[PDB]
Design a protein around this nucleic acid. Sequence first.
RNA 1: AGGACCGAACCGACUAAUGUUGAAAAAUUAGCGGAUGACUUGUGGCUGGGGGUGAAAGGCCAAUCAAACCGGGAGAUAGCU
RNA 2: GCUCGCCGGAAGACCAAGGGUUCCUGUCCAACGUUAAUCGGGGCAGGGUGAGUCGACCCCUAAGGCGAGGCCGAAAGGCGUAGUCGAUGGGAAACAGGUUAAUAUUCCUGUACUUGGUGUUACUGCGAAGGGGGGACGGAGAAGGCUAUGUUGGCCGGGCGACGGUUGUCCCGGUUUAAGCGUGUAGGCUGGUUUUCCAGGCAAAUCCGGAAAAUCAAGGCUGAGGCGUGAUGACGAGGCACUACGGUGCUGAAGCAACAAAUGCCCUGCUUCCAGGAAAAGCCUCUAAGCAUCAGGUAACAUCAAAUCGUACCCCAAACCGACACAGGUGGUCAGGUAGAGAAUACCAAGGCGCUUGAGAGAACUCGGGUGAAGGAACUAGGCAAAAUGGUGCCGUAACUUCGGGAGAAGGCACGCUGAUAUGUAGGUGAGGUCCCUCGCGGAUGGAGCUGAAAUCAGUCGAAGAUACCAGCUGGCUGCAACUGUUUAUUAAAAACACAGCACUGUGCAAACACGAAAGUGGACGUAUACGGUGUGACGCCUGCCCGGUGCCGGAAGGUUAAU
Lengths: 93, 46, 37, 271
Amino acid sequence: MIREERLLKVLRAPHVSEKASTAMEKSNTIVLKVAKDATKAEIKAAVQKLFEVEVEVVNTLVVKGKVKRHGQRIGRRSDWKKAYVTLKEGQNL
Amino acid sequence: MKRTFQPSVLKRNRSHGFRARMATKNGRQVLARRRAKGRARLTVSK
Amino acid sequence: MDINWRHNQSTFYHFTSDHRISGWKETNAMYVALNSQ
Amino acid sequence: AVVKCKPTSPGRRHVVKVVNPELHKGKPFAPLLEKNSKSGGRNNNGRITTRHIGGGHKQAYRIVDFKRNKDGIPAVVERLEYDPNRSANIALVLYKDGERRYILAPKGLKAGDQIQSGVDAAIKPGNTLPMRNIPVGSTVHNVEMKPGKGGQLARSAGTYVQIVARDGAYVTLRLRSGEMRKVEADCRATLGEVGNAEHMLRVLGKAGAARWRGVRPTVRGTAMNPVDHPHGGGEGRNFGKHPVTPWGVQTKGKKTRSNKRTDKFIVRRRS
RNA sequence: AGGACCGAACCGACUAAUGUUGAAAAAUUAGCGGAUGACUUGUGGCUGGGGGUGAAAGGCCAAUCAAACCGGGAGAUAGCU
RNA sequence: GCUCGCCGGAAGACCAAGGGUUCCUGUCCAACGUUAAUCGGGGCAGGGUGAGUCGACCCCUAAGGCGAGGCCGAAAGGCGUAGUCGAUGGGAAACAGGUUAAUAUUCCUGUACUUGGUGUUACUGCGAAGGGGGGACGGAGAAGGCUAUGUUGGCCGGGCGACGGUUGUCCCGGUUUAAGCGUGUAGGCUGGUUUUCCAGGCAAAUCCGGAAAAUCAAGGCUGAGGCGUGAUGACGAGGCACUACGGUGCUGAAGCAACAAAUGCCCUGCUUCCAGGAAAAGCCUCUAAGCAUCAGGUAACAUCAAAUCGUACCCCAAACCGACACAGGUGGUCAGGUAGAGAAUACCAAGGCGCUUGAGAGAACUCGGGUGAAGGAACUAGGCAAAAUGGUGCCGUAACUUCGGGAGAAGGCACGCUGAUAUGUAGGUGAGGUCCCUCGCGGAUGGAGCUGAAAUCAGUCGAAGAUACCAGCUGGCUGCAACUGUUUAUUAAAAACACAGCACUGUGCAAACACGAAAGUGGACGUAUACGGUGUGACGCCUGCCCGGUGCCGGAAGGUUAAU
């Protein structure tokens, strides 16, 4: 099993957008920003054990950071990971 | 017209990359001069 | 712009081309020299 | 059978083929084949060491039995095959215990023909046996120079070696060169002569034929500049020098043997 | 069948005109040669400087080649400007 | 938004490489955009890339790299065995439909498939850095069977028409459906089965190889496509209801046949030719050591797992390489209509564009073109440039020749449209029916239907019927080079280089020779019918004399002659 100390550090934020919103209200999937080194077994276990719901399957993409600039000083943001967590028929959150 | 720089990442790295500078005496001296000059990127890796 | 202007003034500093004056300027200087001989 | 091609399209005007209807039209015997990668004339330093080599057709090596070690077991010749690595043809043979091997094909040898290696072999063409058992004045090919080593003399097509003497532990051999050489008499040799003599009668006809045997062009020395070849330069055709290699050593006469170790074994140089 | 014939792709580059502070540090347009072969091409690899490679022109080796480029000896030396 | 023009083997679509947010939405016009800009690949913010099946990673290897020991080398280091890496190659598996402003073989719907783990049950000999098979692989050519795809008819829905006619031999549109599973066909290959024996596959072997018999004449392997199912589902021209007029839902007819047909598939086939055409693993098998009522193997069922990284967007380009939003360069994939031999060319479809300065005027002159009286190379260094020729069929065709050519020599004639032969022929395809059955994806007959050259005769139109585009100028004498090729990237493509062929010469294998302080490597896993060097340069007739000089080869007597 995955230890609970690992399993708390994985989920990072709920992702709020309109693709996320239509995924919830149309296909049971909650979209959430996860740890960059988090595997699909860790995200599945962490939503099973931290929101106490039943997860059908996880799909993970990794989002690349945008090169912004302040003034005349550039900088890339930071890569993050986004997990499309497809729940079962019985869920709320 | 076909210019000289026809890029390929795999040849860039196999040729001038870090594992290929470290692979020999003189490339390690190259890295030593780039570190000593103090250089933001040593090799061309990415 | 200043960096591109310094490098793009630095373009024909190490040239070789002999039929072109200063590396680039077209002329007839081959025929002028050749006819002088 | 040599055949002049009819002169449709130059390039075919001067070709003479050496066709052989008794060669096997088909794939060679597989577990006696191996990879033979082409080099380009270039050593482990990358450099061109032998010039004029490169390109040509892909070839697979065929392990030809030059040693002929299966003594006393007869072998029937299964077929004859084209070998790209040699001038001669190779015969695929089948021993009585179910082992196939390729040998160099001697002159008369056809399919369905008994050959036999060893000391008590009959003297007839194809039988490898030691030269203390071969009669003097017999044509013999695939000669060993050291006992047990493998054949190295008279292997190329249409080539034989005549045994002229048996003085003691040595046999004096008239090599195809014209050279008289002493070989130890325990060295095996195969009877007969090796058999594609008409190989020398083919004429190739065009430039691309040489190209497809892997022979790149030969730039002649006098066509170069002086930096390239000692012959070099000169305002139209200009030779004026004693003819040399590209490294300055005299061509046209100058003897380049220095061994001193194998001079014991040379009875008379060639002429 | 063919280093076969005509001819597109494809490779090339014979002529002319334009262009020559170009649209382009070598091209465009109209014709032109090869076009199953000694062809052409992709990806990778190997050869290095008095060295490579060269169907040989002193050609090519990163718009550089009768000896690359970078750094150093080095503020070479300059009875010359 | 309506018209107009351009590309349409691309100026459309999909990628690889390369780039790296340029993608999509809102917002701003300072600078960037060769002008203005409300617009933008610009600024700012937000959003966006979803995989057991696609690709990478992974398993295996080529060229080649690195390389424990090792051999070698003043040192640095060179080479290399075991090994280990290295794709551009070999290895398991997913398709259709729908959806987002922006992803989709990834999400959703439906239907699937693959490989491992574990468990149960039934049977059971399993077991390798080892043996065998297989993987496993050339160029060209030829058909045959198909399909993608298209055309026409039928069917279904809609229209009867701004200007003469248009209820019909009329017009517009649609007529689509996959993987998987089942069947096993047109082909292609091979005799099959049983028993005994063996100097081979380092050992063993029931596997492979081999040698005997005996019997049967068939079995096996492979294989496009079709057919059935998937699918009483989806999709579907269009209508219906609301309509932030952007669309959003609902409903939805027919959904067939004939012919033509690939450069795709059977085909890694078949025929043929020399120039003789990767490897290793997965895969199938054999056993050795061992384990043998255990472990393991096989089969069925159930259950779990299939991680990680890529996925946006451009990709013949305003996003890559070219300093530019540059008339240049850049690999693969798809490839509709009409005419055509065709991927040429013309005009078009799908789709995409009008090239980020415009408005005038209508001088010289320059550039790109059109036409030209009479003449017709007089131009000029030179017919440079332009003009001309140009297709298919048939007739006809010289010198010379290596007997192949020359030759498309040269030079001519025919060509449209309509009608008849013949309400479209010869030919191709071929239904229903009929006959037989080793009964079906069968063969024989039969010709409905579809497709359809080419020729002759008759007529008719125009100045002209290869009407556009496309598409040889021809002949005579001669120098050089035999020929195809190669070369001065960027003023020289040539008579120069190359070449087949010839000769001379070296080279006996630890070969000469070359790279290398050496080890070693190439020569070559070649062996004098071979290899290296040099010259000449197809072929034909030939290649004369000179060995005093320089070189080379040979000789050893004498003279001179180093280190010692």
